[PDB]
Amino acid sequence: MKKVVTVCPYCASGCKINLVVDNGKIVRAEAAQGKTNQGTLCLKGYYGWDFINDTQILTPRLKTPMIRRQRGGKLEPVSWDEALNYVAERLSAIKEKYGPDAIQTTGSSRGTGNETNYVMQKFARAVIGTNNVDCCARVXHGPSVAGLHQSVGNGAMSNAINEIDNTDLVFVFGYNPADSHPIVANHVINAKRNGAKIIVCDPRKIETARIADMHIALKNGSNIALLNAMGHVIIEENLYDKAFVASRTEGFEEYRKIVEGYTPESVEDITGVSASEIRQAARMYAQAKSAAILWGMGVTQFYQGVETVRSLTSLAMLTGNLGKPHAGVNPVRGQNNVQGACDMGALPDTYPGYQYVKDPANREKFAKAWGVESLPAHTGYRISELPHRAAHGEVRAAYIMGEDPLQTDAELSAVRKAFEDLELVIVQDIFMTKTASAADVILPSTSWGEHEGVFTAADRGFQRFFKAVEPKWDLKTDWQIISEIATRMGYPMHYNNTQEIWDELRHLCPDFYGATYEKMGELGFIQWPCRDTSDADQGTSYLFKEKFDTPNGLAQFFTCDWVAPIDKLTDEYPMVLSTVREVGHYSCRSMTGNCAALAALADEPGYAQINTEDAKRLGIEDEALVWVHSRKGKIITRAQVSDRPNKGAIYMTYQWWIGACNELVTENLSPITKTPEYKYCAVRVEPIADQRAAEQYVIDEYNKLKTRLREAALA
Numbered sequence: 001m002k003k004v005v006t007v008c009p010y011c012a013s014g015c016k017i018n019l020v021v022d023n024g025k026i027v028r029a030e031a032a033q034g035k036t037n038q039g040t041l042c043l044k045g046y047y048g049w050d051f052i053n054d055t056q057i058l059t060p061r062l063k064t065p066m067i068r069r070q071r072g073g074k075l076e077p078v079s080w081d082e083a084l085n086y087v088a089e090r091l092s093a094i095k096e097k098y099g100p101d102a103i104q105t106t107g108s109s110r111g112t113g114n115e116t117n118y119v120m121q122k123f124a125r126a127v128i129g130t131n132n133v134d135c136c137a138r139v140x141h142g143p144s145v146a147g148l149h150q151s152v153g154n155g156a157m158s159n160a161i162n163e164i165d166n167t168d169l170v171f172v173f174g175y176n177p178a179d180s181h182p183i184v185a186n187h188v189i190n191a192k193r194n195g196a197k198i199i200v201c202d203p204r205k206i207e208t209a210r211i212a213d214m215h216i217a218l219k220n221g222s223n224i225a226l227l228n229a230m231g232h233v234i235i236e237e238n239l240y241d242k243a244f245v246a247s248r249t250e251g252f253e254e255y256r257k258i259v260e261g262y263t264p265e266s267v268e269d270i271t272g273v274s275a276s277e278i279r280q281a282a283r284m285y286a287q288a289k290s291a292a293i294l295w296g297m298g299v300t301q302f303y304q305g306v307e308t309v310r311s312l313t314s315l316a317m318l319t320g321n322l323g324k325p326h327a328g329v330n331p332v333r334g335q336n337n338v339q340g341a342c343d344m345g346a347l348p349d350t351y352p353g354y355q356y357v358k359d360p361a362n363r364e365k366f367a368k369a370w371g372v373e374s375l376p377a378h379t380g381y382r383i384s385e386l387p388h389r390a391a392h393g394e395v396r397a398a399y400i401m402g403e404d405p406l407q408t409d410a411e412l413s414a415v416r417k418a419f420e421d422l423e424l425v426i427v428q429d430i431f432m433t434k435t436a437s438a439a440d441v442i443l444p445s446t447s448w449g450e451h452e453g454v455f456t457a458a459d460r461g462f463q464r465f466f467k468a469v470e471p472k473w474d475l476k477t478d479w480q481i482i483s484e485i486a487t488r489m490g491y492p493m494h495y496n497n498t499q500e501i502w503d504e505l506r507h508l509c510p511d512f513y514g515a516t517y518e519k520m521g522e523l524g525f526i527q528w529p530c531r532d533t534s535d536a537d538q539g540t541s542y543l544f545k546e547k548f549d550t551p552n553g554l555a556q557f558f559t560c561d562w563v564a565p566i567d568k569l570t571d572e573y574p575m576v577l578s579t580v581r582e583v584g585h586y587s588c589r590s591m592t593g594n595c596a597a598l599a600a601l602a603d604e605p606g607y608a609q610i611n612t613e614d615a616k617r618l619g620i621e622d623e624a625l626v627w628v629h630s631r632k633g634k635i636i637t638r639a640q641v642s643d644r645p646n647k648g649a650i651y652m653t654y655q656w657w658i659g660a661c662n663e664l665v666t667e668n669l670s671p672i673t674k675t676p677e678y679k680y681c682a683v684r685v686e687p688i689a690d691q692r693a694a695e696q697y698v699i700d701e702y703n704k705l706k707t708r709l710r711e712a713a714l715a
C-alpha cells in the first residue's frame with residue numbers, strides 16, 4: 001500500500017494531496033503538507049478523485065479513439081493508427097490547401113500539466129506553422145493579463161498566496177474566495193485572524209462578506225463608478241503615496257482629472273452605495289500599511305473589464321501597495337493549471353516563458369531549437385473567435401484539447417453551428433462530454449492520476465504531480481498523441497517522459513530554468529522567475545521589487561468613464577442574471593459530476609439564486625422548477641429563494657448540463673482580450689404551475705442526454 005503525491009486538479013489553490021494506492025487502484029485522497037494548503041483540503045480535493053475509475057454516473061470515460069466518417073452521424077471506434085493518420089492526413093491536407101492558419105488548436109488548463117501545453121504550442125508553431133494556440137485564459141483572466149500587462153508589466157498575481165496572511169487589509173473585489181479557492185479563503189481568514197481588515201465589494205452577500213468589516217454591495221455592473229469614486233477620495237483627502245507615485249508611476253495627472261469628476265456623491269445611484277461607505281472604504285484601503293487586492297470574475301467577465309483591472313491596479317499604484325510583501329495586485333487565476341498553460345505559451349501571442357512571437361530574437365531562438373526555418377510572427381486566432389472564423393471560412397479545423405466549449409462557451413447555440421461550420425473537429429479528452437460527442441474524430445488521453453508533470457498554482461508557483469496508477473485502457477498522454485501526429489506529418493517528435501519536455505522548456509525559458517524537477521520535488525512550490533538551478537534560488541515571491549517590467553520601469557496609471565453592461569433591464573426583465581460557479585462542483589462537472597460523493601450533493605438542473613423580499617412578489621418559492629428566458633434562449637432551473645442574492649439580480653452557474661446557463665448568455669466579447677460578459681445577462685424568471693410535469697421534464701431531458709452521450713462512448 002503506498003502514497004503518491006499530487007496537486008489538486010480542481011482550483012488554482014495548488015493543494016498538495018497524498019493519493020493512497022493499494023494494489024493497482026487509487027484508494028483514498030488525503031491532504032499533504034503542501035505550501036498553500038498545509039494538510040488541508042476541501043470537499044472536492046478530498047472526494048473528487050473517483051472519476052478516474054469510470055463510474056459512468058454522468059459520462060463514461062473515453063476508451064477508444066473514434067471517427068465520424070459521415071456528417072449524418074455515427075461516431076464508431078477506430079484504432080490509433082487509423083485515427084492518428086486521419087488527423088495527420090486531414091490537417092496536412094487542410095494546411096496545404098489553405099495555409100497553416102486555417103487550423104486552430106487549444107491547450108488545456110486541467111489535468112495534463114505544463115509539459116503538454118508546451119508540446120501543443122510547439123506543434124502548432126513548428127509543425128503546423130501557426131500561432132493559433134489559445135487556452136481558457138481567454139474566457140477567464142485574459143482581461144487581467146492585458147490590463148496588468150500594460151499597467152505594471154506582468155499579468156500574474158503580484159504577490160504570493162502565502163503572503164496574504166500578513167497584509168493589513170484584504171481588499172476582496174468581485175471574487176468569492178470562500179467557494180472558488182477555499183485554501184485561498186483560509187489564507188484570507190488567517191490575515192483577519194492576524195488583525196488584518198477585510199473589505200468585500202460584491203453585489204451578493206457571499207460567504208466572505210460575513211467576516212468583512214465592510215461589505216460594499218455595488219449594483220451589478222457599476223465597478224468603475226465605484227472605483228473612480230475611491231480614487232477621487234484618495235486624492236481629495238491627500239491619502240495617496242506621493243513619493244511612490246512620483247518615483248515609480250507614470251500618468252498620474254491624466255488619472256487625477258477623471259476622478260475629480262467622480263465624487264462619492266455623483267456615484268450614489270449608479271453604485272447603489274452611499275458616498276460615505278465609498279469614503280470610508282477608500283480611506284480604509286489607503287490607510288493600511290500594506291493592503292492587497294484580490295479580485296476575480298466579478299471584474300474580468302464584463303466587457304469594460306480590462307479597464308476595471310487597470311483601474312484597480314491604479315488604486316494600488318496610488319497607495320504604494322506594490323513592490324512589497326503582503327500587498328500587490330492579485331488576480332487569483334481560476335483553474336488548477338490555467339496559469340500553467342499560459343506559462344507554456346498556450347496563448348496566440350507568446351512562446352512559453354512569456355517570450356512573444358513578435359520579437360525577432362525569440363523567434364530566432366525557438367526556430368533554431370525546433371530546427372525550423374521560420375516560426376510565424378503574427379498573432380494567432382483566439383479560441384473565443386472560433387465561431388466567427390469558422391463561419392467566415394477563415395478557420396477549417398480545430399484541434400480542441402481538454403475543453404468543453406459546447407457547455408462552457410457563451411452562447412452555446414453559436415458554438416454548435418461553429419462545430420457545424422468546421423471541416424474537421426478533433427477533441428482530445430478524457431470524458432464523453434457534450435463537446436466530444438459533437439466531434440469528427442475523438443482521441444482519448446490519460447487522466448490526472450494516470451500520468452505526471454508540473455502545474456502552476458494561482459500565484460505562479462510551480463509544483464510537481466506524480467503518476468499514481470495505470471490507465472485501464474490503451475490511452476496516450478496528451479503529449480504522446482500530439483507527438484505522434486507531428487511525426488506523421490513529417491516533423492519528428494517523441495518524448496520518453498515529461499521531464500524531457502520540462503528541460504527543453506527550461507532551456508528556452510530563462511525564467512523557468514532554475515525550476516528544476518529536482519527542485520520542485522514532492523512538496524516544493526517554486527514560483528517563477530527562477531533563473532538559476534542553484535538551490536539558493538528558491539523562486540520569486542512578489543514582483544516589481546526594483547522596477548516594474550514596463551518598457552521604462554514605471555507603473556502606468558489608468559481609468560476611464562463607467563459604461564453599463566450591454567443588455568438593458570426593461571420593465572419585463574428588470575432581472576439581472578449573473579452567472580457564477582458553485583462549490584462541490586467544478587466547471588464542466590465532467591470530473592466532479594462523475595464523483596460518487598460530490599454527485600450526491602448536487603445533480604440536475606441546478607439552482608437559480610432568487611431574492612427573498614422580491615421572490616414573495618414573483619410567485620416563486622424555494623425548490624420550485626422555474627424558467628429563464630433570453631434573446632439567446634430559455635433555460636429550466638430550480639429556484640432557491642434566500643436573502644443572499646441582491647434584490648434585482650439572480651444567480652446561476654455553468655456546471656449544469658440540463659439547465660445550461662450558457663444557453664442564455666450572449667457573448668459580449670471584450671474588444672481587447674475577446675472575453676465574454678458572463679456576469680451580466682438580461683433574463684426573465686417565470687414560474688411553473690404544473691411542477692410534477694416539470695420534475696419529469698428535468699428527468700426525461702437528463703436521461704436523454706445521459707443515454708445519448710453513453711451510446712456514443714460505449715458503441
Ligand SMILES: Nc1nc2c(c(=O)[nH]1)N[C@H]1C(S)=C(S)[C@@H](COP(=O)(O)OP(=O)(O)OC[C@H]3O[C@@H](n4cnc5c(=O)[nH]c(N)nc54)[C@H](O)[C@@H]3O)O[C@H]1N2
Pocket residue numbers: 011140173174175176177179180181201202203204206218219220221222223295296297298299333334335578579580581582583584585586587588655679
Ligand atoms: N467550486 C468551484 N470552484 C471554482 C470553480 C468552479 O467551477 N467551482 N471554477 C474555478 C474557475 S475556472 C475560476 S476562474 C474561479 C472564479 O472564482 P471567482 O473569481 O469567485 O468567480 P465568480 O464566482 O464567477 O464571481 C466572483 C464574484 O463576482 C461577483 N460580481 C458580479 N457582478 C459584479 C460586479 O459588477 N462587481 C463586482 N465587484 N463583483 C461582481 C459575483 O457576485 C461573484 O461573487 O473559480 C474557480 N474555482
Ligand SMILES: Nc1nc2c(c(=O)[nH]1)N[C@H]1C(S)=C(S)[C@@H](COP(=O)(O)OP(=O)(O)OC[C@H]3O[C@@H](n4cnc5c(=O)[nH]c(N)nc54)[C@H](O)[C@@H]3O)O[C@H]1N2
Pocket residue numbers: 108110111112136139140141297301334335401402403404405407408409410428429430431433445446447448478579580581586587588589590591653654661662665678
Ligand atoms: N456562464 C458562465 N460560463 C462560464 C464561466 C462563467 O463564469 N459563467 N466561466 C468561464 C471560465 S473562467 C472557465 S475557466 C470555463 C471553464 O471551461 P472548460 O473548458 O469547460 O473547462 P473544464 O470544464 O475543466 O474542461 C476540461 C475538459 O478537459 C477534460 N480533461 C481533464 N483532464 C484532461 C487531460 O488530462 N487530458 C484531456 N485531454 N482532457 C482532460 C475534462 O474531461 C473536460 O472535458 O468556463 C467558462 N464559462
Ligand code: SF4
Pocket residue numbers: 008009010011012013014015037040041042043044045046181182183184
Ligand atoms: S479544489 Fe482547490 S482548495 Fe479544494 S482541495 Fe483542490 S486545490 Fe485545494
Ligand SMILES: [Mo+6]
Pocket residue numbers: 136139140141333334335
Ligand atoms: Mo476560469
